[PDB]
Amino acid sequence: STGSATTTPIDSLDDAYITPVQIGTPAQTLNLDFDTGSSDLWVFSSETTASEVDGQTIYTPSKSTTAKLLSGATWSISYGDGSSSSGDVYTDTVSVGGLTVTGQAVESAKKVSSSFTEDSTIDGLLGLAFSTLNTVSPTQQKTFFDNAKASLDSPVFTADLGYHAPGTYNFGFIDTTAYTGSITYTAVSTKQGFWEWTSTGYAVGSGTFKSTSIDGIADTGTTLLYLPATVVSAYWAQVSGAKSSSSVGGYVFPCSATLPSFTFGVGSARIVIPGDYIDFGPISTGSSSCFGGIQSSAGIGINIFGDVALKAAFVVFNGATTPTLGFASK
Template structure:
């Protein structure tokens, strides 16, 4: 079960230690780019992305026929930072370099969860395989969190679990000096097979953290007091490296002013109301529509069944393909633009030519908009993010959005 990621560029102000007087704050910028590989002709990519999303949120499985004690808040550098986010094949995940105790691993940034976990040297060599595994014995700053454990599991039986420690975590220059790091001592095959991804940086609210007996703060919550602004911004791209930026808003990436969208943080997610959809140039009410989560860790746009049906009714040759496990259509079909309401006054529009997620075969394509199976929760993933500049405001519990330039 992998979740989606992108690398980030950070502009960070370094603070001197409390015991040393600093004459001024020195600002620096850090950029790291990651190569990416796109394969749009893998027939399993689309259905697998859908299965992963369903399992992550515990949705009923997609039917598919086959032919066969609390730690002290982490301190860090002030200002902000950016790190590059590079898409995996079909942009199924966006992966970014992260330094833990001086060791670099490649992690998926996920606004739909709240754990920072990583492959560790405690796993067998066979399980580690081509992954970069964090070795706490090689870190001079690692501290064991006695008695602390963590575990994540999904509806398809996949998951990971392990122990916990505190260490220095650096993302593009933004640094938390005492961040809870969850070390995987067991992972399911689905995680082990994704050899490009060494773990996850959860960026939902800290209340969803799975550490026991006491939940710990996310990286963002840890560094937020030291950031120049209490925000991180996301600029994901389809065929090139994008950025996650902590502590700053880059208006050069936005087309027009940002619209502020209130978030219902009680669930622990970046959750918004989504009362309408736009198909082509027609805006319609989504009667009885479900709330929606802004989730960089999900590849697709999972919408209420009536919304998916209404959209693909406008696509010639589209069908809810039981053999594939989702909506497919001829690759030469003309797709209408699609928009989802984010709160009461903003609609995130996705051009029709940005809807296709992958090819199933030479003539059939798999849509980036799919049904949530009536799960009463819509998941707005990377299909939306690739067309929008999105700012996550941790202090005010809000999103700010604008179309990309």
């Protein structure tokens, strides 16, 4: 089997992407944030505290003939941005782009933090990291991808995120028309439950490539590119007027400045992030200070190749017995 679904930016900055997902019988379609940095499929639901729901589409398990309470199961998750949610669990039929999993754990939110309530465009998350990070207790549950894997033509999914445009998540096959050149594969460590890999270095603009190992995670659920302070400083030093602002919470730059590209290494291959991808617009409406798309990972504890980086590539998440990551230009 295979599946193919279009993913669409939630706003003009590509802050996140939503992908339609069919849950239950008859289908209830919710727009979920596919997140390769976490491993829970959770939804706004008929059980979510009413004051915490503001415009989202909800899953109502009582209206699904295939929903079954996963008796005794609870879940509770906190994300790197300080957001959180928690609740109980149903199993139900879940389909993504024509690919169907029966008996998928659908984690129904009883509570969500303010960041989720305030984002009317995101109806939940669909985790695509390794199932060892799943928060369901007492019985940890498998991700959609893990459940689908055995039925897939090939045990892979791909992320092809657009810059200010829709893209595609495919399951079970690699679309050879979706990228240019070849796919370079690189080793993954699953020790922390993430798609964790080591970039071979970086370049700023037309500068010379610096060979240096940068361990990080491929995370579709993080907007920006978070790298060591040394790397980030080297980048912003090439932007006229750029500075790190403690009041704003990162590097900002005058909207009049031109941004250089940023290249990252995948083995001997190179992915070029165009300068425009690094512009996240005014810090506040009408401001001449623009927020940068490359920021320091210092104090996160891990480097994160988020959407800024991933959307510059066609990315293969290879879930074979020995998992790997592939990157191609496009």
